[PDB]
Write a protein that binds this ligand. Sequence first.
Ligand SMILES: C[C@@H]1CC[C@@]2(OC1)O[C@H]1C[C@H]3[C@@H]4CC=C5C[C@@H](OCCC(CO[C@H]6O[C@H](CO)[C@@H](O[C@H]7O[C@H](CO)[C@@H](O)[C@H](O)[C@H]7O)[C@H](O)[C@H]6O)CO[C@H]6O[C@H](CO)[C@@H](O[C@H]7O[C@H](CO)[C@@H](O)[C@H](O)[C@H]7O)[C@H](O)[C@H]6O)CC[C@]5(C)[C@H]4CC[C@]3(C)[C@H]1[C@@H]2C
Ligand SMILES: CC(C)CCC[C@@H](C)[C@H]1CC[C@H]2[C@@H]3CC=C4C[C@@H](OC(=O)CCC(=O)O)CC[C@]4(C)[C@H]3CC[C@]12C
Ligand SMILES: CC(C)CCC[C@@H](C)[C@H]1CC[C@H]2[C@@H]3CC=C4C[C@@H](OC(=O)CCC(=O)O)CC[C@]4(C)[C@H]3CC[C@]12C
Ligand SMILES: CC(C)[C@@H](C)/C=C/[C@@H](C)[C@H]1CC[C@H]2C3=CC=C4C[C@@H](O)CC[C@]4(C)[C@H]3CC[C@]12C
Ligand SMILES: *[C@@H]1O[C@H](CO)[C@@H](O[C@@H]2O[C@H](CO)[C@@H](O)[C@H](O)[C@H]2NC(C)=O)[C@H](O)[C@H]1NC(C)=O
Ligand SMILES: *[C@@H]1O[C@H](CO)[C@@H](O[C@@H]2O[C@H](CO)[C@@H](O)[C@H](O)[C@H]2NC(C)=O)[C@H](O)[C@H]1NC(C)=O
Ligand SMILES: *[C@@H]1O[C@H](CO)[C@@H](O[C@@H]2O[C@H](CO)[C@@H](O)[C@H](O)[C@H]2NC(C)=O)[C@H](O)[C@H]1NC(C)=O
Ligand SMILES: *[C@@H]1O[C@H](CO)[C@@H](O[C@@H]2O[C@H](CO)[C@@H](O)[C@H](O)[C@H]2NC(C)=O)[C@H](O)[C@H]1NC(C)=O
Length: 1101
Amino acid sequence: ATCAMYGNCGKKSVFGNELPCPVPRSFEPPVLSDETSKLLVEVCGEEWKEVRYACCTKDQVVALRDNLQKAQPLISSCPACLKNFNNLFCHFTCAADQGRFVNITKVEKSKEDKDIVAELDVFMNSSWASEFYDSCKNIKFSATNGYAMDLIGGGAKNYSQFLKFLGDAKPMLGGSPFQINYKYDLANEEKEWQEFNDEVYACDDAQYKCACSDCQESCPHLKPLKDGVCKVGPLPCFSLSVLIFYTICALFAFMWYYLVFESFNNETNFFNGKLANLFTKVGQFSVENPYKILITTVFSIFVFSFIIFQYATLETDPINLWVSKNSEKFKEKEYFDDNFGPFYRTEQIFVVNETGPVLSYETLHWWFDVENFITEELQSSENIGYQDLCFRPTEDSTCVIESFTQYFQGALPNKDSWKRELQECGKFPVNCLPTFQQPLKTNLLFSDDDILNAHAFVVTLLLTNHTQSANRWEERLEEYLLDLKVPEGLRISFNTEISLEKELNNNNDISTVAISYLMMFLYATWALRRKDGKTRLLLGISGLLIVLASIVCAAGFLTLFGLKSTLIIAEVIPFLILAIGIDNIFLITHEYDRNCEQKPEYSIDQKIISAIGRMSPSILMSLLCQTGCFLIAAFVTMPAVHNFAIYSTVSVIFNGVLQLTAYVSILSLYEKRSNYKQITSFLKTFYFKMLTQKRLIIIIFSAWFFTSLVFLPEIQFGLDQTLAVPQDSYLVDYFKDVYSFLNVGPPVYMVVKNLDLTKRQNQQKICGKFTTCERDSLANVLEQERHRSTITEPLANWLDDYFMFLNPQNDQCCRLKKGTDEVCPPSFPSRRCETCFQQGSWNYNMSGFPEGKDFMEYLSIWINAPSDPCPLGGRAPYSTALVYNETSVSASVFRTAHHPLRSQKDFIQAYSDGVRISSSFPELDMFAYSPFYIFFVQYQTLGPLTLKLIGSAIILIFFISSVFLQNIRSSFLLALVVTMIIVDIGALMALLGISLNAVSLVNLIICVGLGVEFCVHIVRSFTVVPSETKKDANSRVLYSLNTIGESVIKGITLTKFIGVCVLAFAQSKIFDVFYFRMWFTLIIVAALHALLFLPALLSLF
Ligand SMILES: C[C@@H]1CC[C@@]2(OC1)O[C@H]1C[C@H]3[C@@H]4CC=C5C[C@@H](OCCC(CO[C@H]6O[C@H](CO)[C@@H](O[C@H]7O[C@H](CO)[C@@H](O)[C@H](O)[C@H]7O)[C@H](O)[C@H]6O)CO[C@H]6O[C@H](CO)[C@@H](O[C@H]7O[C@H](CO)[C@@H](O)[C@H](O)[C@H]7O)[C@H](O)[C@H]6O)CC[C@]5(C)[C@H]4CC[C@]3(C)[C@H]1[C@@H]2C
Ligand SMILES: CC(C)CCC[C@@H](C)[C@H]1CC[C@H]2[C@@H]3CC=C4C[C@@H](OC(=O)CCC(=O)O)CC[C@]4(C)[C@H]3CC[C@]12C
Ligand SMILES: CC(C)CCC[C@@H](C)[C@H]1CC[C@H]2[C@@H]3CC=C4C[C@@H](OC(=O)CCC(=O)O)CC[C@]4(C)[C@H]3CC[C@]12C
Ligand SMILES: CC(C)[C@@H](C)/C=C/[C@@H](C)[C@H]1CC[C@H]2C3=CC=C4C[C@@H](O)CC[C@]4(C)[C@H]3CC[C@]12C
Ligand SMILES: *[C@@H]1O[C@H](CO)[C@@H](O[C@@H]2O[C@H](CO)[C@@H](O)[C@H](O)[C@H]2NC(C)=O)[C@H](O)[C@H]1NC(C)=O
Ligand SMILES: *[C@@H]1O[C@H](CO)[C@@H](O[C@@H]2O[C@H](CO)[C@@H](O)[C@H](O)[C@H]2NC(C)=O)[C@H](O)[C@H]1NC(C)=O
Ligand SMILES: *[C@@H]1O[C@H](CO)[C@@H](O[C@@H]2O[C@H](CO)[C@@H](O)[C@H](O)[C@H]2NC(C)=O)[C@H](O)[C@H]1NC(C)=O
Ligand SMILES: *[C@@H]1O[C@H](CO)[C@@H](O[C@@H]2O[C@H](CO)[C@@H](O)[C@H](O)[C@H]2NC(C)=O)[C@H](O)[C@H]1NC(C)=O
């Protein structure tokens, strides 16, 4: 047909490539020969089997075939790109209608005085070019670690300039000998020349499908964007729901403006009475035999104090007092540890220049002399150094130090060229290798990639020895770094593996405990004095000693079963039990004084027993409400706070028994012997007058509750690490640095279990680099979940490395002695061994990959490869990432990483991604594991949990109140007040900055217990009244306050005030933030509700 090009007339210059001979557009080439037809179908494709009058000869096709092989390896990953590439250069040289879309701009003379072409012009549809560029745009070269466009396209980012590179005349560098120009626009009104248009194949094509790694389109777009996790609008979703609820509530109010029990009572009444007879009998038994029960108490406490002193007194460590040993994250940790070995122990050192850069010859010279000392000649007491515990990648390899010193291999560089050398090594780590032969990322070494302007560099040391010997060395390193004399301006902050455990069990706040104890003995004596001003010091002493006998009994009774209490939480029980324990002393003693005031016919023995039998249900309900609240708080699974609820539950029970039995006897003896002679309101009228405004108080307090129900969703989550460690420690500085100067994240592992990996079906579920495999494979999904999730850094797939290792192109990798299956020795650099797979036995669509028994035959030589000849050896990188027994690969690990994680909110968000992603593969047994996951397993279900525990506690309070008060209406009011205190404190939790942990969730569950003590006494007096008193509501409530109101203010109210105040001053901030602000806000909030609100509500019950 019409050909503008045909045949070769000779080379343009000596040794130059032969150039084709130009021909007129009317030239008609003869019919093709038999050999040409065979070549065209093979070299180009079967689609050319029909062409008769081609425009190319035998020399042209063989030359074309030779040239095409040049670029075949680069673009062989994606068959679509390869198919398109061949088509463009096949039609351009052999298409019958070559002249239709080809024009000769310039023709030059050859050596043989025969004209040859020097420049050419072609025209094609822009759609064709756009598709062609798209197919080969995202091809990735295995060895270059970058897009293949750099090698073939020269980094071209536009389709227009991509063809330009191909058309560039660069014969010296192997380019096209003659310039080629491509036109993307042609208004061919004349239509003399026809534009070049032909079929275009994209990676999505079924026939020419390409892997996800090759092109974006083939990757899984099945990424349903999870929604609803965050808030909606400018306010939280729940708050908007509440706000509309108030609006509709107001509209209803606007419309308002315009406009058998007897059987239960009898049974309960008999039950209530039976308790009174039971309790008075106990008092008679105790009072009638004072010495008998006093000797037993003294003897018993000595028996129990013996157990705690020697038999059992233990503490714990971070992984035993903050993680439940039954959770799923701890069953996974044990499995990973058993097979793939425990994670490395990590020591980190930060060298920080607060202002300005760090790297200077003075600082660099100084550090080189203190990093060659830690890692070479520290020699802990047992003469074990870092060289006996450090992590060695192989059997014989210098162990890993992740420091910038490794760029120079521990050789102090010269004073002149150190700046340029460091920049070059950082910019291109491949050109600056450490002694253990692996590139060091600049993010793991410096705060920022600028290097020279970095504010701090990080030194990491890895210990693969977990015996107690490694602990001994870390003691020496901790001591060495503390006393190190850094230059002026610089700073150091480090965290050895054992630093956390040492500092947690270091705070000793027992001094302040003895001060709170001293204050309450002072106050108790003052508040227990007689109406005449006389003081009874002995009674006050018994109050303090009686509570101690409860704590010691609990710590001795409970330690028998094997419970261990933490040092941190063993300093909090004394305040809690004493605040609750001493409450019943004043009520019994004070009420006893009243009985002496009137009706003195009874004697001391008869008066006290009457005092005990009268408020016994009031005391009994306090004990039963201080064990349900604590027992419900024992459902928290953190061992540190689960043992705190069990320890307090037993202490409260023992304190009650040792008060209605042992203190009653003591009181009788003290009063009988003393034989006191029979005894012969500012700020109240003002307060009493205030209660006259029933509606003003209710409206104000009601508004406070409702405005505090739209701030609950503003409460944060998580416990800050800096709080736990005591102040002035070296870990407060460290945790501050990790949040600002570290640019790497924990290395999440993706363990896969019970997978065959020997049948081709299973391998396709982890493929990430081949075409015929599944699209939802593990490698493809994890590749896509890198722009939206927290797991960003690339995945280390050992299965794709294994198959690449068998590639015949990498001949050196899989050398096998010819004629045998034995491995070619490394000392055999001769033609005595060949590749495992021949040229035609390996294809990118898994046509000849190992299967069945053959899979484990070659896996035993890849995982033992030296890795020196070619980088695809597997002995060094993936030695410990497999658990195989020459018949299966039962387990395996794929390593990834998170991003910096610079906050407590990112730690919780990251943990969610690990759980979310591990549940995206229903066909696998995958589970992700990172070192920090076990410590954040509580916040996943802390939302529903806190509602259930608090909701359960309020329900329990209502149930017991109805049984004792014998009045449903009164009980409901008490439950309504208690739930009003909890909500109010919850909103104040957001403002004060307290978060929601398992430590501040138990504190909020025992607030209902403490919040019922204030109100239970007021409510009961309202229900039960003397006959002489009027039955009108105002009279009864006024009667109640005048009777038991004083004891609440001088007792339950003020006593807790003294205890909490002392707890504010402490070294650890965990006591100041959680156990003080929570228990100090409760008293103020509960005091207002109990005194100002509750009587107003009762009067209008
Ligand atoms: C909080 C902390 C922080 C995080 C942390 O813990 C927690 O995380 C933890 C995780 C840890 C690492 C994990 C596991 C290893 C493997 C081991 O590794 C064997 C060493 C070999 C590694 O081989 C290959 O390593 C990579 C694959 O593994 C390959 O890269 C890619 O692999 C995939 C691509 O396919 C994709 O994944 C990516 O594209 C890319 O990743 C890489 O290219 C290739 O080198 C070294 O091989 C050499 O072999 C010959 C020498 O022997 C050399 O030959 C020569 O001989 C003379 C030399 O004498 C010369 O001068 C001649 O000129 C020359 O001819 C030859 O050139 C050279 O290759 C070395 C230790 C290390 C790094 C650990 C260190 C410590 C951590 C970073 C911890 C760390 C502390
Ligand atoms: C009741 C009182 C005494 C508090 C008890 C719990 C604390 C000791 C917890 C609360 C949050 C924990 C921290 C949460 C996050 C991390 C990151 C994580 O760091 C790792 O690299 C993992 C180390 C490992 O796997 O052991 C574990 C340590 C640390 C600081 C934890 C140490 C122990 C902390 C401070
Ligand atoms: C009768 C009781 C239940 C009322 C008083 C409950 C309070 C203890 C408040 C104070 C702050 C509230 C929390 C503030 C924020 C949220 C939003 C949301 O938190 C989540 O993390 C949702 C997702 C998840 O559960 O992981 C679910 C409710 C929760 C935990 C709230 C539950 C109820 C809390 C604990
Ligand atoms: C591997 C890198 C260096 C990249 C840039 C090189 C690719 C080579 C192998 C490719 C790119 C474009 C190809 C190319 C361009 C155009 C022509 C004109 C033609 O009618 C015969 C084939 C010929 C001569 C081929 C030869 C092989 C070339 C030059
Ligand atoms: C830490 O950074 C500060 C700020 O750059 C350094 O202080 C400067 O040091 C240079 C010489 O290195 C002096 O010329 C400047 O006068 C210093 N002050 C300022 C404000 O720039 C300090 O040297 C750095 N630390 C160390 C150990 O050198
Ligand atoms: C951790 O290091 C210690 C000390 O090097 C190892 O224990 C030593 O083992 C050698 C070899 O059996 C003995 O000769 C030494 O006497 C041991 N020293 C001590 C102090 O016990 C220990 O084996 C290492 N742990 C691991 C898991 O490799
Ligand atoms: C893709 O996989 C096939 C599977 O065998 C490879 O081999 C081809 O198999 C088909 C089976 O119908 C034959 O028709 C082809 O002739 C085979 N290809 C040959 C002999 O080259 C194939 O090589 C793989 N690669 C592709 C399709 O590009
Ligand atoms: C080699 O390991 C494989 C693990 O895949 C063993 O085969 C499995 O063993 C477990 C435990 O007994 C069984 O529950 C599985 O049914 C076995 N078959 C599988 C997982 O396909 C195999 O027995 C081991 N070989 C030897 C000699 O111990």
